[PDB]
């Protein structure tokens with residue numbers, strides 16, 4: 119409908135999944151708020167527009183259409199008002215910094231060592247499947263009370279939920295172009311129910327220190343628990359992004375450090391630089407790249423576009439984190455980039471609830487990896503491909519050493 123952006127009519131879903139950065143570089147220059155036809159939504163591409171929409175009193179949370187098809191109601195990312203306040207109060211206790219500091223090291227460090235012990239003397243590894251994803255899901259899985267769910271299964275679940283959640287392509291009429299692409303999401307949810315329903319049965323009668331047991335019990339009147347149908351969509355929120363993103367973050371940080379070998383050496387020599395390395399990794403390839411959204415609650419003007427009430431806007435934080443109005447040569451990883459705010463954890467009342475936990479998981483994992491394999495080198499015989507528009511990370515990370 120906007121004549122000068124008619125080229126957007128020819129942008130494809132596959133192009134956005136394989137490499138969104140060229141289209142979004144054009145968006146940041148041409149139309150920081152733009153309707154992208156294949157996504158069927160306005161998209162915010164710049165840091166200023168993303169932060170404004172995420173913090174605006176004239177917007178509230180909404181799930182993307184394929185995200186809502188995948189999670190249903192009430193997913194913590196998609197609700198507001200009293201329901202959102204309750205779900206935030208439900209998830210926040212185990213994520214409080216003072217609480218995380220009590221146990222995070224005894225949680226993640228033995229897990230990192232266990233996975234490292236399986237390959238640290240091999241001279242070769244694929245770090246996404248052998249280290250980053252397992253440490254991420256095993257840490258969170260244990261925290262949640264899913265100790266008896268294998269890391270293989272947790273990784274399978276987040277991969278299926280990922281593809282269903284981001285099955286965003288629509289046709290001329292705004293209908294999903296790939297309706298069959300939700301089926302594996304439905305299959306994942308059905309498997310999750312068969313595993314987690316007996317655990318919830320047990321936690322209702324015998325609460326313990328698992329996070330999901332506390333989601334059932336915390337803040338409730340005596341003898342009551344939150345209904346499982348009320349909490350399952352937030353369980354799915356965790357079983358996708360909370361399981362997937364710390365692994366994406368550490369893998370992307372490693373890819374960035376490999377691209378700057380002098381800086382990889384710096385960090386191996388001085389592991390106190392790992393937090394700064396991770397912060398730049400999250401900016402450089404944001405794990406949650408364009409998965410969240412808001413909806414206007416009143417008519418509002420953003421980036422010169424007059425939006426009616428009820429207008430969804432996708433927040434492409436991964437593009438916002440390459441805003442050249444903020445950063446110099448953002449496409450390059452640079453450990454020594456001057457520390458600035460970034461949007462990889464979002465903004466506003468729906469900003470990431472697990473920042474402190476997530477940074478610790480990534481930090482400890484990289485600490486133990488560099489301790490165990492200080493001469494880590496990237497297998498330059500194999501390339502690193504990134505995939506994903508909603509959630510983005512490297513599909514593999516082949517390394518060698520010795």
Ligand code: HEM
Pocket residue numbers: 172194195196206209213258356359360361363364367400404405406410411433435461462463464465466467468469470471472473475476477
């Ligand atoms: C590097 C890892 C992670 C990244 C980059 C990340 C990023 C994000 C982003 C971008 C959002 C949406 C914010 C917005 O819409 O403005 C979000 C929401 C959320 N994240 Fe994180 N996340 C990570 C890990 C985690 C972990 C490990 C947990 C839980 C232990 C978690 C819990 C949540 C929750 C509960 C929300 C929903 C908040 C709400 O809607 O009120 N995240 N995250």
Ligand SMILES: COc1cc(C=O)ccc1O
Pocket residue numbers: 195354355356357358359360406409410411
């Ligand atoms: C923290 O987990 C999630 C976060 C988001 C943010 O947009 C979307 C789906 C998720 O599962």
